[model samples]
Target: DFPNNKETGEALLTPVDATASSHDGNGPDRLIDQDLTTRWSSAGDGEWAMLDYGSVQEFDAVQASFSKGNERQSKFDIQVSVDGETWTTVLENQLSSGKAIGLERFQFEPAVKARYVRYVGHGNTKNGWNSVTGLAAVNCSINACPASQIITSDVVAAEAVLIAEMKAAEKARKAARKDLRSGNFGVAAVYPCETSVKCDTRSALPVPTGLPATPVAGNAPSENFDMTHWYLSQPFDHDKNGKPDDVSEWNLANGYQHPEIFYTADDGGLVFKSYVKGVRTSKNTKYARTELREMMRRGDQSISTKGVNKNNWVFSSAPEADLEAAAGIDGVLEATLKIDHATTTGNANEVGRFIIGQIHDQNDEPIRLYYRKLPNQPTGAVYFAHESQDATKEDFYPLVGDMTAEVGEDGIALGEVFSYRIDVKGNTMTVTLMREGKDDVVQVVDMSNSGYDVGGKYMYFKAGVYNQNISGDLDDYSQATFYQLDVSHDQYK
Candidate 1:
C-alpha cells in the first residue's frame, strides 16, 4: 500500500468485485488490509489479481505499492474487461526499475474506463516470487489526485474502492459485495453475467454524431465518450440461454466479446462457426445486392474490423437515465477513435460499408461505417462501388458527403489502427480521418439542409460491423475494431 492518498472526497464508488490467488498464508485479502504489516505474495510468475467495479468507470490512474520479497515481482501489466471473458490489454508489459526497497508505484494515462481490472505479473526482479504490499484506485472521474492528507490525516477522499455486495447501475450482486468486503479478493472466479443495462436507441434521428475520431495509441480508450454506451445487435438471444439458436434478438444480455455481434436475418445461407479467437463467417451466400437494396438486408460494415469473416463485434455502453442523450445538447460534441479492422477476401470479392455510427431511416436506427462494393466485382479496389445510404445516400441523390480524403490514399484503407475525428455542434459538421502515423485528410459539411441534420437529429453511436451484403459470395464478409474510443462534449458539470 502506498499509504498516502490525500484526495479523499466522498468515495463515490467502491470495489464491486476484487479477488486474488496466493501460495503462502500471504493471500489477496492482505493486499487491502490497509496495514503495512500485511502483504499479499505469490510463489510463481502466474500471480494474478482481479478488480471489478460492477459497471464501467473512468479513472486517472491505478495506484499500487510493492514489498520487496526474495525474488519478488518487478514488472507487470494491467488488463481490463467488461464481461470478464474477452480481455483487452490496456497497459502492455510495463517495466519496473527493480526497486528492492522503498514504496514503488505504478500508474495509467489519458484516463480510461473498465468494470474489471486484472493484474498479471510476468517476471520478478529476482525472477522468482511476485508480491504486492497493497493496491488503491486513483479515481480520475472527480480528480486523479487530491490535496491535503488523511492517513497523513486525509479523509474525505473522492475515489473509493468497491467491495462486499453492492448494486451497480446494472447488475445487482449484493452477495458478491458482501463476500469481497469480508474476504477481499476471495470471491468466486467467474463474474456473473452482465444482464441488462439498456443504452437507449431510437429512430427518425439524423444519426447525430459524426464518424468516431481515430483512437490515440497507448492512452486510455481514445473515444472519450461514456464507456457503457453500446448495445449489440448480434445473436440477440430471445430464450436467454446464452446460446445462439435462440430467436434472433437485438443486443441481448450475452455480455461483451461475443460472436453474436455478427449474424444474419436468414437461417439458411447465413451460418457461423464459433471457436477460439473469432467467429468464422463462411458458406458463400451468392445472393445479390441491388441499388435499391436496404442495408444489405440488415447491417453496414466498417473495413477496419479485427478480421474479415470473423465473429468479432463489440461496442461500449452509455448512461441510460436519459432516453435521449447524445451529441451536442445545445452546442457541440466532438469524438475520436482508433479502429482496427479487416475484410475476409484476400481475393477482391467482399463488399459493403464497415464503420461504427448511428443507423438511419429505421424506426430504432443509430449508425454505421460503410464500404460499398458492386455486385460481381471481386477485386479489393474501389472499382465496383455500389450506392449505400446512412452513408452512400438514398437513391444516390442525398449523396454521402464524404470528406474522407484521397480515395485509396486517404479514404478507408483495407485495414488500420485508424486515426479519425468528428465534431458535431450546429448545422455544420467536420471530420478528419487517417490511419496511425499519417497526415490527416478532412471533410466538412453544412448539413442544416442535408440528410444528416446537425441540431435536428438525436444521434446515438454503434461501433460493431453492420455488413450490407446479402448476395455475391456466401463467405464474403467485412469487419472493424475500435481500440481507443474517447468522446467528450463541451458541456460537463
Candidate 2:
C-alpha cells in the first residue's frame, strides 16, 4: 500500500499479545506501527513477537526488514498457527543472505494458511540477547515478496540436531525433578527426602571449618545456674600495658532474644554485637576508653565460650577467700562451652582477643585459654598464656595448635563446642579439652609447675570478654557469648 513500491505486499497481520523475557517499554505493540523511524526493539534471549490476522489466509511467502542493516539482525524465524492453539514453524529459524542492504523475501512450495504469525529475532551480529530491531510479514502468493524464493542455500537455519537433543535432555531433567519425590538431580542423583521426618537434634552437623556457627539467641537454659553464683560479671581488667582505660558508663549489652535462656535482669547475657560509637580513628592513642563486662549464672553443665575489646572480662562466683586456696590444687575444675566468632570488621583488624577460660591471680592478671584475632590470619586463633609475655604487645600467643588448619567448606566460622577440665592429679597439673558430639579429647596440656604456679595466694576462675586491646577496633567494641558456663571444682561439687 506504499506509493513508492507497489511490490511492498500487504502486511497480513494484526497485533496479538507478545511476551518478552524482559522489556523496557518497546513492547510488541510497536510491531505494526509501519514506520521504520519508530520500529520495535528488544534485547536478550527468549524474546519474540506474535500477531493475528483477520482470518486464516493462504500465505506462500514472507519477508523481514532488519532495523539498521548490519547494525541489526538479518536473521529471524517466522512461525504460523491456524487455530492459534498449535503452531508450525513456517521458516525453521534462519537468516537472509543478500550481502546488500536490501530486502530479502521468501516463499513456500504450495501455501501456508494461518491466522497467526510470530517473528523470532536472533539479534544482530553483536546483539547477544538476539536483540532484534524491525520486522515485516505478508501472504506468500505475492510475487512481490515471497518466502520460499528468499530462503537461498546460503541462508542459515536452526540446527535441528541441537533442538532434538535439548528437548530430550529437558524431558529427562523435568522427569528427574519429580515433585517431592527425589530422582536424578541432573547427571548424578539421590533418593527422595523423607518429607515427613524431623531434623534430629541428636544428629550433630559437621561445621564447615572456616565459618563459625551462630547458635540460637535467647534460649531458655534448663540447666543454667542462677545469678547469685557469679561474683561480678563486669569488664574488669587490672593488667593492661597501655594507659589504664576509664570505663565509667558500664552499659550491659542487650542479649538479643528471650529471657528464658539468659538472666537478662541480672545482666548475665553474653551478647556480642558489632557496633560504632561517638568518634574514632585507625590507631587512636588515647588510652582508648574500652569496656569489659562479665556475669555468671551457675555453670554445672557444658557452656558456650567466645570473646572481644577495648578490654573486659568476668570472674567466677568465688570470692578471694574461696579462690585456689580453698579448691586446692588437686581439685578438678571443668567448664564446657560453645564458641562461635561472628564477623570481624572495620578497624577490628587481626581481630581482638576473647578468653574462654582464665585462672586469674589476686591482681586480675590471668593465665588464659584464649583466641586472639591477628593481622592477616584467616580467622584469629587459640592459645593459653601464663600472664602476658613478649608477644603480648601484638596478638596473643596461644599455648596450643594453630586455629586455621582444618579444611572446611566454611572454615573458622564453625561453632566450636568443648569442655575444659583442669585439675592436678598427683604433682602434674593437667588441662584436657574435649569436643561435644565426639567421644575423644581434642588436646591435653600438662603444666606441672611450668613457670606459672597452680598454688597461689588467691587464684580463681574467670570467663567472658577481657579485651587486651589498647589498639585495633576502629569500631570501638569487642563482644562474645557463653551458652553454658557450668563450673564444678572439687569443693563446689
Candidate 3:
C-alpha cells in the first residue's frame, strides 16, 4: 500500500514494503510466490519496480536513491514519463554490494509537467539478493517561473530576428557593390554635411586624440600640455580670406584651439582633453595642497565647456541659457551620447571641448547658436551648426541636448569612454549608444526619421556628454578603438 502521506500533492513514491511477497513457505505473509510475478519479485539476478501515481500536473525537480545489500554487481536505471506509457531515462547508476547511494537530484528549470516514474534494477551477484531497499521522489513547485528568465528569452528571440535581417541586408549591400564595380550605378549626389543626412560608415568618427597612447601624470609639462584643454580663438575672418582683417572682430568663444599640437609625434591617434576652471585652493588647508598636488585632483571653479575632443560641443554650466541665446527654439532638445571604456590601464579620460556658432534667418535675424545639455550630474552637450552661419559664427554649446547622461547598464559614465552607433534600413532607424557593451537606447523616440535629410546635403548628429569626470589620461582609453563607421540605405524599386 502506498503511504497515505504521499497523497498530499507533494512528492509521492511507492515503496517495496507495499508490494513484497513472502520469502518463506508459510501463510499469506510468509509464502513466497513461486513464479515471482508480483510487484516485489526476486528473479535469478534482477528486480523491476514501478510507481503508479496516476498523473501529475507540474514538477521542477526529481530525485532517487538506493541501498545496496550483498550484491556485488548491482545496477539500476531510473525513468520518468507523463502518461506512464512511454518513459524517458532520467538517471542511471551502478553500485557495489552493501553500498548505500545517497540522494541524486535533477532539476527541470521550467518545471516539466510529468506524471509517471519508474526504476529498474539488474545484475545481482546472488540469485536471491536482487532487491532494492529504499527509493524516494522529490517535486519542486514552490516557484513557477521567473520574469527575468522570460524577458531574457524574448530578447534572445528578438536579437535573432534582427541578426537575420542584418544578414539579408548585407547580401543586398554586396550585390550593390558588385553592380558599382561593374559600372552599372552612377554617383547619386555629393552629400555635404547636411542637417539630417545620414552618412555610410562602420562606426562613429574616431576622436583624433583619445586612444593608443600612454596616460602620463599631470606633472610633466609636455604631458600636462598634452592632457590640458586648449581652445582656438582668433578674430573672425569674415571675408573667407585666411588672413584676419583689422575690421574683424575677435571671437573669443569660437576660436579654434589646437591642444593636440603639444603631444609627441607618435601620439598622432585619438586624444582626450578636459576644460575646467580649477577651484581656489585654500592656503590653510593641509590636505588641499596634497590633493591639488596631483594634477588630476583639481575641481572646477566655474562652469566649463561641454563636448568631446573630436566632435560635438555643449555648455557644461548653463545649457538652457546657451540654447535660448543660440537656437531661439523653445522646445526641449534631447540627445544620447555613448562611450566605450575598456582599457588595460583601468583609468578613464574625462575631457571635452566646446564650440559656439551663430544662426541667421533669411531676414538676417542673428541668434547666438548653442546646444542643450541633458539633465543629470555628468554635464554633456550636442554639436550644432546654423544652416546659414559660416565657420566664424559657429559656437560650441556647453550642453548638447535634453538627453540626460545616466549610468549605463554596464555602470560606465556616458561619453567618457564609448562609441555611438546608428543603423538605418528603409524607413526604420535603430540608434544604439553603448558603454562597456551595455546598451543605452532612446526608448521613446521614433528613430525612423533619424537619418532623414531636409535636402540631400548636410547631416546632423545630436551629441551630448556625461557629468562624471574621467580620472586617467587619453592614452589609457580603451584599445578597442573605433575602427569603422558604417551607414547604409536600401533603395528598392
Candidate 4:
C-alpha cells in the first residue's frame, strides 16, 4: 500500500486541462485526440498565432519545448519583455525533422524581470506541420540585489588638472581682446626681398578715424595716408631679371600679398593697374649661323629656329563687391577672386586681367565665390573655392551647381562679378553673398581639418596671372583687368 501524504502550499499542483480524460491503449487515434485537446495548436502554412498570458510581476527564468515533425524545418526565437513594450531575446533554436523530442533546458542565474513571453516561429515545415509544446516559467524571485562600487580617487585628481589648463587659456584670450579695445592694432615687420615681401614682426597700430587699428611695426609708410584707399605697387624688372628696376621702381613689381589692405576700410576700395611686357629671345648657339661656317665656303649652314616665351603681372583686390560692416581685429569682412586663367586668345604671350576687391583674414582665409562655364556643359556652375597658403589638391574640387540657378531667373554669368561677405569668429567661419541688396544666408566651409595656422598677420591682397595647363607659351591677347575696387574695416564710421 502507498502512503498518502497531505501537504499545504509546500506543493500546490494546478491542472491546466482537468476536463480531458487520459488516453489509453489506442494508437494513432489517441495521438490525434491528444493533439486536439492539448493547449498546443498547429501553425498552418505561412501563418502564425500568439497567446496572451496577461501580465507577470518579476520572473527570474523561462523555458519552452518545440516539436520536430517528419517535414521541413523551422526556427524558433524566445523573447521576454517587462511592460509588454520592449522585448529582449533570450533563446533561439532550429527545429528539424524528428518525432516529439525533449530539448536541452536553458536556465538563467541572475534572472531579469519581464511581464510577457513569446516564441516567434520563422519558415515552415516540409508540408504543413509546425508546433511547440511544454512552455513554462520557473525560479522567479522578487528582491533587490547587491550594489556595485563607486568612483576611485585617481579619476577625480585628473579632472582637476584639465580644469586648470582650460582656465589659463581663457584668460589669455581675454587679454588679447582688451588690447584690441585699447586702440592698439597689431604691428608687423616687413622684409622686402628681390622677389617677395614678408612681415615677420607684427604689433598693433593705433586706430585712426574709428577704423580697426592696423599693424604698424614694419608696414611701408606713405604721406597723406588713407586707411580706406590702400595702394599696392609692384616692383619692375623689365628685362625678366629678378631684381626690381629701381628701389622706387617697385611700382611695376610691387604686387600685393593676400588679406592685407584689400579689405581694410581705409584702403579697401582701391584698384591697381597691371603691366605685361612681351618676351625677348636670343638664338641658340647650336642652331645659329656661325662665322666658322663661312670658312667652310657655305653661305649659311645653320637653320633659323624660333621659340616663344612670356611672363605676366596682375593686380587684384579681395573678392568683396560691397562693404558696410565695421571691422575689428578678429571680426573682419572681405571677398577675393582667384583667376586660374588670365590671357588674350591670339597672342601666345598675352598677360591676363586683374580682379579688384577687398581682403579680410579676421579668422580664416576669406572664401571666393564665383561661377564657371564648365567644359561641354551648358549651364555655368557656381563654386566656392577656399584660398589659403596651406591649400592642398583636394580643396579645389569643383562643386555641382544647384538647379535653381539654371532657370535664368537669378543666374550668374561667366566673368561676372558676384559680391560676397565673410566673418570669422573663432573656429567658425561665416560667409554671405549679396542677393538683391539684402545679405542671404551664408554657407560655411570648415578649414580646421586642413591644418592652416593663421591669425593676427597683415593679409596682403595680391593677384598674378599664370597658366597651369598651357604647354609652351600663353596667348598674347588673353589679357584680364580689374576696376572699381574698394576695402574698408571699422574705419568707415
Which candidate leads the pack in lDDT? Answer: 2
lDDT of 3 by residue, 1-493 (tens): 1111132343243322222222111111111222111113344333445554555745544443322332244456656677766877665564432322322333344445556555555645544443443444455444322221222345445645655775698687556433211111111221122223332232332223432244333322223122122222211223344321111001111111223211122222222221121111223211100000001101121222222111112121223433223212111222222332322221112222221222122122112222222222344433322222222332222122422222223233434444344432322323344444554643222323222221111122211111122222223222111122222222111
- Tens digits of per-residue lDDT, candidate 1, 369-433, equal 34433222232121111123244443211112231111333343443344445544543445555
Give candidate 2 misplaced runs (Cα > 4 Å): 1-223, 233-333, 340-352, 363-366, 372-380, 387-400, 403-416, 424-427, 436-446, 451-456, 474-478, 491-493
Candidates arranged by lDDT, highest first: 2, 1, 4, 3
For model 2, give the 10-residue run with minimal summed lDDT: 182-191
Per-residue lDDT of candidate 4, residues 21-120 (tens digit): 1111111111212232123334443332232335554444333334442223545555667665676776556353232222223445456655555555
> What does candidate 2's lDDT look like per residue over 281-309, in tens digits?
12332222222222221221122111211
Ranking by TM-score: 2, 1, 4, 3
Candidate 3's C-alpha runs over 4 A off are 1-269, 272-411, 414-416, 437-493
Comparison by TM-score, 1 against 4, better one: 1
Work out the TM-score per prediction.
0.32, 0.34, 0.21, 0.29
What candidate 4 gets wrong by more than 4 Å, as runs, is: 1-236, 243-328, 331-382, 387-411, 414-417, 435-441, 453-493
TM-score: the better of candidates 1 and 3 = 1
User: What's the lDDT for residue 199 in model 2?
Assistant: 24
CA lDDT of each prediction against the hidden true structure:
0.37, 0.41, 0.29, 0.31
Question: What does the lDDT come to for candidate 3?
Answer: 0.29
As for lDDT, the candidate ahead, 2 or 4, is 2
Q: How accurate is candidate 2 locally (lDDT)?
A: 0.41
